[PDB]
Structures are given as C-alpha cells and as structure tokens.
Design a protein around this ligand. Structure first.
Ligand SMILES: Nc1ncnc2c1ncn2[C@@H]1O[C@H](CSCC[C@H](N)C(=O)O)[C@@H](O)[C@H]1O
Ligand SMILES: Nc1ncnc2c1ncn2[C@@H]1O[C@H](CSCC[C@H](N)C(=O)O)[C@@H](O)[C@H]1O
Ligand SMILES: [Cl-]
Ligand SMILES: [Cl-]
Ligand SMILES: [Cl-]
Ligand SMILES: [Cl-]
Ligand SMILES: [Cl-]
Ligand SMILES: [Cl-]
Ligand SMILES: [Cl-]
Ligand SMILES: [Cl-]
Ligand SMILES: [Cl-]
Ligand SMILES: [Cl-]
Lengths: 317, 316
C-alpha cells in the first residue's frame, strides 16, 4: 500500500511535503504490467513498459525523493523533466509543485510518451505536459524553469537546458561517463554563464538515446585540422580526460584516441601525455586548476561548467 | 649635397654597401616641387608631392639607412616596400639589392603611384616594380620576400605579409598605436607561426589609409554578443591595452572605450579593470605573462605575434 512507501520515505528523512506527494499518486496506474501491490510500493525500480522492442522503468522512489529534496523542489515551481517514461515521477512532482506549479516532461519513445499522456489524463492531472521527442532540445515554449530534473543517463547538459533555466535554478542530472563505464549524478545551480555544482552519487538510470547519447559521435564533427603545437606531460591522464568530458562537453574519439575538439585547437590525449594542435589555452587552464587541486578526480572538485564561456575547476573546501 | 649626406650616414655607423646607394640616386628627381639643392640632401623629411588634396613625403635618409641595416638588406634580395610614394626609397633600395635583386613597392594613391612609375622609367631603374593599390594585400606573385619594408604608419602587419615572407625573413615596420597615438617601429623575424620582434625606436610617418588605417573599424564588425563572465582588476591598464593592440591586432572601440574583439569573447577595457564577456583565455595569458615580466611597456618586451596562433610575450 502507499502508506508503507510513505512511511519508508519518512524514515529516509524525506520532508512531509515531498513524502505526501508519493502518498497521493497510485504508482500502479503507471505500470503497463501487473504486479502485486505489495511489490508496487516497495522502494525499488519497476519495469513499467516492455514490448520486446522498447523498454521503460519507474525509478526507485527514495532516489527520486532525494533528487527532489536536493533541488529544493517546492510549491509553485516549474520543472522540466527529461526522460518521462510512463509518467509516475512527473505525476509525483506535479503534487510537489502544486496547482500553481507546472511539470513539463519529455519522453523520446512515441508509444511510451502516448501512454504517459493517457495516464496523466486518466488521473485528472492538469499541471503535467508531456512532450514526445528528444529531450536534447528541451521545451523552450514553457521556459524559464526552476529545475531541470533528469531521469535518464545523458551525455551532457545541452545549452538548450541551460538557456531554458532561470538564474539560480537547479539541475539534477546523471551523466554518461562511458569512457569509465560509470554514471555519476551531479547537482548544479545556474549562475550565468555557468552551472556550478558537485558530484552526488552513482546512479543506474537507463542510458539515453537520440542526441543525449551520441555526444562522442557528434563531437567528431567539431574536429578541425591544426598544426602541431607542443606536447605536455600529463599525470593521471584518465582522470583528467573524465574532467574534460564533464567540463567541456567537447570530448570525442577517433580510432580509440580521445580528443578535445576545441574552437581554436585540438588536444590529443595519450597515456599520461597530451599533444596540442593549434591553441587550447582553456585546456592548459583546466590542467593548472586541477594541479592546484591536488589532481583529485571529479568526485572531489567543484565544477563550473561554462555556456558560451570556458569551464573551470575549484576546490576551496 | 649627396657627398655630405654620405659622410653623415657613415658617421652613423651605416655600412658602406648601404650608404653608397645614397650616392647613386638623385633625390631631387623624386620631388615634384623644386627645392634648393642644399636642402634636398639634408637629413630630413621632405614634401615630395602636394596637389592641395593629396600629398606624400620622402623620409629621413638616415632613418631609412638604419632600417636597411637592421633588416640586413643585401644583394639579390626581394623586398616588398609598403608606401612607395614618389619612389626615392624604393630607388635607393634597388641599388642595395643590385641587378639580381628586386623591389616591389606599393603606393595607394593612383596619382602618386603614376609619378613613381614615371620617375624610375625616366631614370632607367629596372629592378623596381611599383604597384598601385592597398599595401594591405601585399603582392603574392613576387613573393617569397626576404624583407617587408614599411614606410608608412600601419595599424597592423596583416597575415598577407606574414604569408608572403620567407621563414627567417624580416619586417621593419612603424605601427600606429591606437591608444598613445605614437608610431613605434619594430623589427620582426618570421619563425612560423610567429613574427618575433622588438621595439627599435619612435618614428613619425604619414598614417596609412585603406585597410592599413581602418583596423579599429574592421574589428568593430567582429564583435559578437556574449554573456558577462567576470571582471578582472589590473594596474597600468593603458600599457596592457597597447600590448593587446600590438599582439592581437583585434582591438576596436565604441565611444572611446576599447574592446578586444576575440574569437570566443569580448574584453571591455576600463580605466582600472577589464570586463570579460564570453571568454578570452588568450588575453588572460597575455596578462599573466605581462605581470610576470614586471608590468613593463612594449619597449622592453620580446613580442611573439601569432598568425593562425595566439600571441605571447617573453622577457628573457
Ligand atoms: N533522448 C532522449 N529524450 C527524452 N527521453 C529518453 C531519451 N532517451 C531515452 N529516454 C527515455 O528516458 C526514459 C527513462 S525511464 C523513465 C523514468 C521516468 N521519470 C518515470 O517516472 O517513469 C525511458 O522511458 C526512455 O525511453
Ligand atoms: N594602405 C596603403 N598602401 C600603400 N601605400 C599607402 C597606404 N596608405 C598610405 N600610403 C602611402 O604611403 C606613403 C608614405 S610616404 C612615402 C615614403 C616613400 N618610401 C618614399 O620614398 O617616398 C604616401 O605616399 C601614401 O599615399
Ligand atoms: Cl572512430
Ligand atoms: Cl567507434
Ligand atoms: Cl595551447
Ligand atoms: Cl598556451
Ligand atoms: Cl579559460
Ligand atoms: Cl598605464
Ligand atoms: Cl593612466
Ligand atoms: Cl574565465
Ligand atoms: Cl604570453
Ligand atoms: Cl609566453
């Protein structure tokens, strides 16, 4: 029953206003497959749709509640959810933001998105708008948003989301760190022209398709030919490459060699060494900042992701 | 007369092969308005043309001789002269490079250029080619050049000249500084992808027209909209802005405020600080290097002007 889930969330430290949201939405109405109710209200992930071709899951309730607590989701806010699925999380967040708030959710699968629209209608929810398409583009018509809530692993936070986010808005997002076979989730706050934030924990969301899952491939198109400049010894190169992936969103690879596709140069990353073609002073700056921060991995650094500005690292503690 | 001029050039340390060229060219043949011969050979600037609307001047002989010495002008070289005027300096250099050398001289004024052509034609000087046009473009066909010899104040050394210059080639050039309104002359040597050089002395030349005199206006068109990033305080801002003018050649201005029009951002220069819109790590690096070099002005620094590369400052 919903009561047990509500209680379990309270035990997790989830506040009353967010926990109450989970008490008001019947999770079973979002599952296309029948499960015993005792299973429906367990704090676990549930397959919500599976036809052999397409698949979707309802996320672990406590993780979603934590995400909501972390971004400070509350009454009257406007949220852009990426990876709506059959709609359960969107429905829960709709109760959190209340009647004056709004939830816009994007689902890439046409079939799954249509099922979500139906579920929203069946439950009589009037403040949840589902959009069927690639979350990469966001939904500018209903921006600005207070929060960008991502429930699918994405290669990057596209500039679209940044532009659609209010100054001071938050982004909770699981990033596909494919080069390390990991999915770290981060919490960012917008302070134009940056998203400033920190790593939170490892997550297990479905990996995104479309333009939210082909960044390496897309960035190959950004590569240009530049004359060789110089080489620089690089310690813990893999750790730095992870940081370039997260901070620049311009990392790509050709034949297994990773390259930063810069606007004025290309940086080829090798085993504890990097070759610079053209100019990439922004990469030299990240390296200096990283060195000043003890060469620690991304989990222990404050990230300043620039939009129409280069990125930087800080570790003031 | 020319005999006195020669003696003076020698007294200034000018080599014999260069000073001798001044004994072979009649300066009076390049002046359209008669002057007493005793004045013609004084070591000064003379008005060589003036129809009331347009005018040109023959530069100070010793300054030209020094320029020649500094770029190592010698026999068989190919020189691109910018700002040919009525042709006197081109003619003198033609003697230095000899029958096997060549002087390609560009003059922007159609009338003055025609006069220059008539002058070398009349004197039978055959290794001088005058081009009537904007020196901004140089003259690709006759490159590679050993030397680019500039005799007019220019806003920048365009990439065209860099491309047309041999590796190891030299450029002697007076640059129109946008802020201080001075015309310091610099000696550069090409070491792809840079022109590496140093300030030599302050000069006074006619300020170039065409694309060699409208850099601020051209760069204003390169400005783009970028979000405010951050503000950076700095001391001796004017000194730094002049270095940005010289090293980046991307300076512009609107209503008296100078801006660096960068590829990825715009830097607004204020009296005691600069505001960065978008990003300009290349400026951030020049700033750090300048501060490292003691916040000194361009006269004391080694400039590495990049072409298809960002620039750098050194002070070894
Ligand atoms: N590029 C892209 N844009 C928008 N949605 C995507 C996507 N790639 C994947 N997805 C979707 O993201 C989803 C995440 S699982 C659904 C979690 C959802 N918040 C709920 O409450 O059920 C899947 O349904 C999947 O098809
Ligand atoms: N963009 C441009 N390209 C080539 N010449 C230019 C110019 N702008 C100005 N000039 C010219 O540069 C000249 C400099 S005065 C001439 C010095 C000349 N070497 C001589 O011996 O007389 C003037 O004739 C002037 O018209
Ligand atoms: Cl490949
Ligand atoms: Cl591949
Ligand atoms: Cl670089
Ligand atoms: Cl560099
Ligand atoms: Cl930077
Ligand atoms: Cl100053
Ligand atoms: Cl001052
Ligand atoms: Cl910055
Ligand atoms: Cl520098
Ligand atoms: Cl340097």
């Amino acid at each position: 029953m919903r009561e047990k889930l509500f209680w379990i969330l309270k035990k997790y430290g989830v506040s009353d206003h967010i926990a109450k949201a989970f008490l008001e939405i019947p999770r079973e109405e979002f599952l296309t497959k029948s499960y015993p109710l005792s299973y429906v209200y367990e704090d676990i992930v549930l397959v919500s749709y599976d036809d052999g071709e397409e698949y979707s899951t309802s996320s672990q309730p406590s993780l979603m509640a934590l995400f909501m607590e972390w971004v400070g989701l509350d009454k009257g806010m406007r949220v852009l959810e990426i990876g709506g699925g059959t709609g359960y999380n969107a429905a829960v967040m709709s109760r959190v933001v209340g009647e004056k708030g709004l939830v816009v959710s994007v689902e890439y699968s046409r079939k799954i998105c249509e099922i979500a629209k139906r579920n929203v209608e069946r439950l009589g929810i009037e403040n949840v708008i589902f959009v069927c398409g690639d979350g990469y583009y966001g939904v500018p018509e209903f921006s600005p948003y207070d929060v960008i809530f991502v429930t699918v692993g994405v290669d990057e936070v596209p500039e679209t989301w940044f532009t659609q986010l209010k100054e001071g808005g938050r982004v909770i997002v699981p990033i596909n760190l494919k080069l390390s076979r990991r999915q770290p989730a981060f919490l960012f706050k917008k302070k134009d022209p940056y998203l400033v934030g920190n790593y939170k924990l490892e997550t297990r969301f479905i990996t995104a398709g479309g333009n939210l899952g082909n960044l390496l491939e897309r960035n190959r198109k950004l590569l240009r030919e530049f004359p060789f400049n110089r080489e620089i010894l690089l310690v813990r190169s893999h750790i730095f490459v992870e940081l370039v992936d997260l901070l620049t969103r311009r990392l790509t690879e050709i034949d297994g060699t990773f390259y930063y596709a810069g606007p004025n140069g290309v940086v080829e990353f090798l085993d504890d060494r990097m070759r610079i073609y053209g100019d990439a002073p922004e990469i030299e700056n990240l390296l200096t900042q990283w060195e000043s921060c003890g060469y620690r991995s991304f989990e222990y650094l404050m990230l300043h992701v620039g939009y129409n500005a280069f990125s930087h690292i800080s570790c003031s503690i």
